[model samples]
Target: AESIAQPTPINVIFPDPALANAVKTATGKSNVTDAVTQADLDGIATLSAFNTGVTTIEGIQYLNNLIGLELKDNQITDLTPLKNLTKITELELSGNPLKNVSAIAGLQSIKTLDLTSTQITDVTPLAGLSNLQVLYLDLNQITNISPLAGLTNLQYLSIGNNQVNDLTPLANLSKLTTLRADDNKISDISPLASLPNLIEVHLKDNQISDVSPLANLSNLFIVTLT
Candidate 1:
């Protein structure tokens, strides 16, 4: 019996155009060309196209084995296409117009996720990723970070330049070493006292009026509070 092939999903377009022009831009020529067909995404584990000017991310959802992906410097706003790539370990979305990032909830195996310079507000979706170690959420509109308390494996975290004022949720991150949460409304350093492994910390331009909580953190080599 012969079986007919089903058409591609409605969300994806074959031979992605975003990737096609990006390749041409990288080469700095109109005659040269580069393209990624639907066949190229199969079993792809990693891709790095930093600052390539991609506006859309289609035809990538089908890559179930994809582990690492980079789409920095683009105008992409939606993250719906990345929902099914739960096997991804490292995902970079820096320099985009992203807002809602709840699509990361199912990626439990992710380790490093970058959302720098995006428009995201809520980050409750990232709380479930216990394997997450390095996270970059800088320059967003987020305020609440209580969901991050469960991420005990975090080693390096940067959530700088946001509306976050509270630091009480960081009480349990004993394995933390480097933290960058500068340029915010934080006023408390008490939550960071329990963290014994803190080596580098930045709390500059904040509302904090106390440095007494940092006395126990003898391992601190670099501290910024200006």
Candidate 2:
């Protein structure tokens, strides 16, 4: 049986023009003062440009029922407005100057998160995000990915172009199908041999020396070890 999202009404009038235009792209509203229905607030898959000109997301609290949100390419520093938006599943906050991600801890329903090309150094807040299936942490300042051990349901994981040096935490993610961890300081991939479901693996520009662990992975169709 297919599941449906629980829709909730949130008729709001945004004050900022930059945010107002983005809401219209997400909710089909004519203007910021227009009355958006419950159906409009729930389905935001094809949402418009949110952070192109808008720096502050002050009106995001009203979209409690928002199931998907993308706020990339901006200069946002504070993310306090996204604290209560726990109903979202897909979130993209990449290509920004954001460093403070303290409010991202409460969004437990998130399944996919893209944090590529950001100014983040630490991801200590992503402790118990068990629902995550796909994550992109490429092109950041991350060193330790121990917090990602909690997301056991991950299938598509990419943490390339960072300062990571360990692959021990990714050992338990047995359900992973695609893993891209290029341009890092990783040396050991013996732990990844246990992941039988791996189909495509990219480990380029790393300190890896052993390909014996991945030699037995029968399902491997594309393996880049350069």
Candidate 3:
């Protein structure tokens, strides 16, 4: 005797018109404002809705299987809806108005995370995400980076055009090959001596008294200190 499975409705409604239009384009649906079944979104492994003017991503939680998501250059502020996207490995949310990004703390599978040109300040939430390789925190209001101290897996980091003055947190990231910290208040060059993998370093427009620490790095080729 076989048991009959109950059919439950899992339709999602996107409130933002731009997000709705993006969903319509991704799902090949004629309309996405009224309802979009979970089945239509679960199969999508990647979605690109960049520069679509999406303010809210309310209905994007249904796309639980998303491995890559690009929502760059949008007006999105609230990140509460992205907490469910745990499977996302590469998330591009650059050029948004996002400030509170604590919702992405649980997404440990993320490798390349881009938050460039945003209003981000506190990165305490990103401490637990150890899988991150390439991180872009450029052009923000961040002053302290103590949270990134444990991210030893980071290979590429761009923190240019910010208010960060300390390079102590990045000393442990031995895998770092490319680092950009231009236009900040950094003065100490001692922490960079420990990083053996550093190849490219950009320290232009910052306070520096010595260049002796970077002499030991054999792999270093590009050095822009002007």
Candidate 4:
């Protein structure tokens, strides 16, 4: 009538000292002499290693049950270790030096993602994630937003302080409730006329002289055009 699944008992070594220290805190282990087994990490659902000076996350893949992860403000550049972490619902990687996000393309279970100040220019890796609801891309080098056209489920999005000039890709995102695109090259805001769910909009320091497109949205209460 019932079944029990045993966690894999394989041992793995964490190459980074700071990462290992954080894993020890997550696993409640006094010290990992040689390595930590997969069973030792399977029960952990959340791990917060923010600003821990982690340069690499080599052994973090063994945390198969991790649902929430915080690795913000570190020296991490490569995201290869997070490719298999599909069950993660919330991931925070802000303030890292990451430029590429191809590794986490398969993580469809993610609902909220933070990539602020990560220096990412390309958003092609985020196209297939249909479950994502919130995303943050502020303070990056992003210029093109065409890849985000398919994310219809996005409700809260922030792309402030980038090089984006076009808003045509966001025309179909009717579910968007809040938007922040401050400090960009955006001029044409005609695409926002189709979104009726928009309640808050922040378009400060952009090249916009007209505000007629957002007049029809009866739900809109907060707007910053200066």
The numbered model that scores best in lDDT is: 4
Per-residue lDDT tens digits for candidate 4, residues 32-140, read 4544455667777998889989898886676788899899999899988788886899999999999878988999999999999998999999998888999999999
Q: Encode model 1's per-residue lDDT on 143-191: one tens digit a residue.
A: 9999899999999989999999988888998889999999999998898
TM-score of each: 0.85, 0.86, 0.91, 0.92
Alpha-carbon shift of residue 81 in model 2 (angstroms): 0.8
Model 1's alpha-carbon lDDT is 0.78
State, as a TM-score between 0 and 1, how close model 1 is to the true structure.
Answer: 0.85
lDDT of 2 by residue, 1-226 (tens): 1112343222234445676678776776555656665455555543446457767776676666677777778666677877877678988888877774667888899999888887888888877678999998989989998888878899999998999998888889989999999899989889889889999999999988888989889899887867
lDDT of each residue in 1-226, candidate 3, tens digit only:
1111332222236678777777677778665544445666777688788898988888677778889889999999888877867788999999999886889999999999999998998889999999999999999989998999999999999999999989999989999999999998999889999999999999999999899989999999887887
Model 2: which residue pairs collide? Answer: none
**Candidate 3 — which pairs collide?**
none
User: Residue 1 in model 3: shift from native, Å?
Assistant: 28
Q: Pick the candidate with the highest TM-score.
A: 4
Q: Model 2 — which ten-residue stretch has the worst lDDT?
A: 1-10
- Shift of residue 53 alpha carbon in model 4, Å: 0.6
The positional error of residue 62 in candidate 1, measured at the CA in angstroms, is 1.7
